[PDB]
Scaffold this active site. Structure first.
Site, mmCIF file in Angstrom:
data_model
loop_
_atom_site.group_PDB
_atom_site.id
_atom_site.type_symbol
_atom_site.label_atom_id
_atom_site.label_comp_id
_atom_site.label_asym_id
_atom_site.label_seq_id
_atom_site.Cartn_x
_atom_site.Cartn_y
_atom_site.Cartn_z
ATOM 1 N N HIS A 43 12.345 25.084 -55.908
ATOM 2 C CA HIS A 43 11.039 25.613 -56.113
ATOM 3 C C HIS A 43 9.940 24.574 -55.767
ATOM 4 O O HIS A 43 8.826 24.975 -55.539
ATOM 5 C CB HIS A 43 10.895 26.088 -57.543
ATOM 6 C CG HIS A 43 9.810 27.082 -57.723
ATOM 7 N ND1 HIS A 43 9.828 28.299 -57.080
ATOM 8 C CD2 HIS A 43 8.681 27.057 -58.459
ATOM 9 C CE1 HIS A 43 8.749 28.988 -57.418
ATOM 10 N NE2 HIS A 43 8.037 28.260 -58.262
ATOM 11 N N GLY A 145 5.964 21.046 -66.080
ATOM 12 C CA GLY A 145 6.350 19.785 -65.505
ATOM 13 C C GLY A 145 7.727 19.272 -65.886
ATOM 14 O O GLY A 145 8.172 18.247 -65.351
ATOM 15 N N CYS A 147 10.381 20.911 -65.123
ATOM 16 C CA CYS A 147 11.285 21.453 -64.050
ATOM 17 C C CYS A 147 12.109 20.303 -63.477
ATOM 18 O O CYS A 147 11.565 19.207 -63.086
ATOM 19 C CB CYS A 147 10.385 22.201 -63.013
ATOM 20 S SG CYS A 147 11.321 23.247 -61.904
#
Ligand SMILES: Cn1cnc(Cn2c(=O)c3c(=O)n(C)c(-c4cc(C#N)ccc4Cl)cc3n(Cc3cc(F)c(F)c(F)c3)c2=O)n1
Ligand SMILES: Cn1cnc(Cn2c(=O)c3c(=O)n(C)c(-c4cc(C#N)ccc4Cl)cc3n(Cc3cc(F)c(F)c(F)c3)c2=O)n1
Lengths: 304, 299
Positions: A43, A145, A147
């Site tokens: 992503h 954040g 991720c």
């Protein structure tokens, strides 16, 4: 009585030595650096114009190595190859991580627990313990954040990575992949509202936690009702608890031997709690039946 | 919100084992000094009332086996500071982080790295209770495990584990070897006094509830600090200090709810109960998250 009981995570140092930051343009998240490869959620190659429905393979072919800024603390690492395996981007870099632990990638089963090292901008921030839910979500604690933060277990000196964090669903639970890039559950790496299947309670873990409660001196919920395994499972399913298998009964053996409470006797206690409730009492300080400790977790903490 | 520990790697790199005879426990190696509980110098005959001065006078550097894994660190000096033994070694730990020793107050939380034979086994979050015990989780062999906080790159060490009390709660010292509470390092009858609820942490938890939109309990009143403290003590809650009021300031600013107005809201909960309602999905008020933990974890 005995010696206390807490959710406990594995020491995070071996994983901390692997965390890096990965940036595409304005987009930053966390990566995992093992030998000369950095793994992170794909992503990171999307933009807000892309995110609703990214064509990842287009996005990636349009990428160059120099588009990826990988930072390990203060040192910038040079990306010299890139590829994508399912929902994981792999960046090959020109140096090996000296702090690479002995490690394996494993795909965990619903019910199993693991530790999560929550990271932001490549820096570790906190460690806690979670379980893979039967609906393949996880109930983590993560902010924007996070991720790319990873979940793992440690055995002797070997880190088994089992989870990479991708997203927070609208209900506030979390969805992510194994380290081969395959989602746990029916989720997709698109910025679309996604629901999970109905969750259920992990029965074998509740039983293990009831045995912990006994080991800690909390015994109010014990009874002398009898149950067979089949009759216990009929009541379990009625209350959206997972079936207990004979393998579960076997794995509960050490806890049963230590406390002298037969597994099927503990099942009869749980059956009564399910039918009658806790009557505003607590067990190990909890008002709710806890299902995120495995039998192994209990034994390790209360015997090992 | 949930309970998180700090990443434990900086502390992991400081853990060693210390042995005297057949007795082994954990020690903390920072620069060229290893710190550990002085109980390590006692035998089963010494335990009820050891004469530590005497036992230490009879020790030499060569009697202490300090190991980082299987690697022995040679001891070149020893002393005792309150209830901690300090062993000077000939190697500065290359993994020494930036660090401080701090003595914490009741209510403050910290992470514990539980270790056995110098080997870390798990990490968890704890609070110092008002009765100066912790509700830890520890087995035999955990003596010398430490509790700590991290601020930026700096490790603030605040607890070294010594012993389990008869109720199964834990007692220990700061890193200058001074016990939290009235406890002594000998095998005697000592008991934890009656505990109380950590009011400042309950308030921080209410603030967290508000931040997340769960705000039914916000009542229409205020209280003075004195009247609140007098009512709190009736419900076995701790009184608030001026320092508690100040550490609640960032949550008060974030929510726009004055500290004393939240006190009035908690006062109503104590006086009336929940009415069957929950706060953050809990029928129980949580008292082991500090105002820092709320800030740290909402951001
Ligand atoms: C509140 N919260 C709790 N856990 C999290 C974790 N968390 C992040 O950390 C995060 C982030 O750091 N980032 C940076 C992005 C991001 C935004 C844009 C834009 N515009 C482009 C790329 C990314 Cl990766 C999305 C993220 N998302 C959304 C997301 C993430 C996906 F991998 C995904 F496939 C998807 F479809 C959607 C997210 O869920 N947030
Ligand atoms: C179940 N559990 C939960 N937490 C713990 C921690 N835990 C240990 O780890 C442990 C240990 O590893 N050890 C090794 C000893 C030990 C035994 C002898 C003998 N004989 C001599 C010296 C020591 Cl340090 C005592 C210990 N004790 C008892 C003790 C410890 C004290 F420092 C003390 F001053 C005191 F009076 C009594 C203990 O409480 N156990």
């Amino acid at each position: 009585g005995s010696s206390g009981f807490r959710k406990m995570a594995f020491p995070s140092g071996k994983v901390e030595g692997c965390m890096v930051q990965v940036t595409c343009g304005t987009t930053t998240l966390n990566g995992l650096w093992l030998d000369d490869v950095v793994y992170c959620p794909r992503h990171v190659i999307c933009t807000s114009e892309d995110m609703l429905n990214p064509n990842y393979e287009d996005l990636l072919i349009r990428k160059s190595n120099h588009n990826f800024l990988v930072q390990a603390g203060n040192v910038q690492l040079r990306v010299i190859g890139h590829s994508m395996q399912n929902c994981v981007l792999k960046l090959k870099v020109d140096t090996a991580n000296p702090k690479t632990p002995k490690y394996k990638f494993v795909r965990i089963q619903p019910g199993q627990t693991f530790s999560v090292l929550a990271c932001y901008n490549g820096s570790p921030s906190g460690v806690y313990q979670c379980a893979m839910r039967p609906n393949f979500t996880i109930k983590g604690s993560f902010l924007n954040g996070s991720c790319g933060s990873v979940g793992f277990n440690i055995d002797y000196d070997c880190v088994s990575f089992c989870y990479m964090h991708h997203m927070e669903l609208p209900t506030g639970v979390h969805a992510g992949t194994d380290l081969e890039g395959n989602f746990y559950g029916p989720f997709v790496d698109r910025q679309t509202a996604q629901a999970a299947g109905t969750d259920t309670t992990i029965t074998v873990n509740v039983l293990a936690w009831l045995y912990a409660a006994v080991i800690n001196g909390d015994r109010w919920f014990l009874n002398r009702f009898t149950t067979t395994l089949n009759d216990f499972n009929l009541v379990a399913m009625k209350y959206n608890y997972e079936p207990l298998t004979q393998d579960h009964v076997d794995i509960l053996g050490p806890l049963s031997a230590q406390t002298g409470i037969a597994v099927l006797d503990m099942c009869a206690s749980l059956k009564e709690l399910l039918q009658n409730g806790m009557n505003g009492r607590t067990i190990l300080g909890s008002a709710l039946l806890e299902d995120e400790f495995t039998p192994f977790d209990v034994v390790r903490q209360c015997s090992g």
